[PDB]
Design a protein around this ligand. Structure first.
Ligand code: HEM
Ligand SMILES: NC(=[NH2+])NCCC[C@H](N)C(=O)O
Length: 241
């Protein structure tokens, strides 16, 4: 019941109630993604926003038993069903709040991995057979509710990689793999997509595309939590589990 379309987010909370900080986080996020000049680097995200294809949820760290990982697992199951109907290019954006002034990027990434770990406990489906369960396997991807996802962390502590600063809260961006159908890495369209996004990053960010994004697949976990510099994590060092 915490899965929201744009028009529903304002009813999340009002004032100091649980989620009372969500409507403002939603507005900061949409302002970032819809900004005109320079445009947000990912036109897919911008187009998804414009087309009503982004859904939202939240975690309120003050109330983990009612507004935390158990509820987010329910929201994610509902989102997964939604993501397989209508437009292929949908995204779920989950704000984790209230915001913590001065948090370091490493702290927000720690919080990200901890939240994924807490979700695994609430998964009602077995881990997919086509995906290795061992997070040190080159082919590991995070899975939930019977399928792999692409998931990444955004944080206000991304100072140079501004594309990943979506507002004052740690923000989790979830997609089922369906979003990439038609823009695989070998495809003409997929190469054009990476060109276009990376041109956008070269007009928006203070640091270029991270090496773990590739030239334009092993150890995808490193993409979930890009650093703010050119450091490259050890491949077998995924924090999950
Ligand atoms: C609110 C939704 C979205 C946000 C906030 C978002 C954000 C980003 C960001 C920050 C990047 C730069 C690389 C990175 O930091 O990981 C990126 C790249 C990209 N996004 Fe999105 N995105 C969104 C939706 C989508 C959707 C729906 C697709 C579906 C096709 C998509 C496809 C891509 C691709 C292909 C890249 C390029 C990867 C590369 O150059 O190697 N995005 N996006
Ligand atoms: N935000 C992003 N980096 N999006 C692109 C994710 C693509 C994903 N690594 C794949 O193999 O399909």
């Amino acid at each position: 019941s915490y899965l929201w379309r744009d028009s529903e987010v304002s009813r999340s909370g009002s004032g100091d109630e649980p989620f009372g900080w969500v409507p403002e986080a939603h507005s900061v996020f949409t302002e970032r993604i819809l900004a005109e000049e320079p445009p947000y680097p990912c036109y897919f995200g911008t187009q998804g926003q414009q087309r009503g294809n982004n859904s939202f949820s939240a975690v309120d760290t003050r109330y983990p038993d009612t507004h935390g990982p158990a509820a987010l697992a329910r929201s994610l199951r509902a989102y997964r069903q939604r993501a397989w109907q209508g437009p292929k290019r949908q995204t779920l954006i989950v704000f984790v709040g209230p915001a913590v002034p001065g948090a370091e990027l490493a702290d927000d990434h720690r919080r990200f991995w901890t939240l994924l770990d807490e979700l695994r406990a609430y998964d009602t489906e077995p881990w997919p057979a086509d995906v290795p369960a061992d997070p040190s396997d080159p082919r590991w991807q995070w899975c939930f509710d019977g399928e792999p996802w692409f998931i990444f962390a955004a944080s206000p502590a991304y100072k140079d990689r501004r594309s990943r600063d979506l507002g004052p809260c740690l923000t989790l961006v979830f997609q089922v793999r369906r979003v990439f159908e038609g823009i695989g890495g070998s495809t003409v369209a997929g190469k054009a997509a990476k060109r276009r996004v990376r041109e956008g990053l070269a007009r928006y960010d203070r640091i270029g595309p991270h090496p773990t994004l590739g030239d334009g697949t092993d150890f995808e976990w490193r993409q979930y939590t890009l650093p703010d510099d050119d450091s490259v994590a050890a491949p077998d060092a995924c924090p999950v589990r």
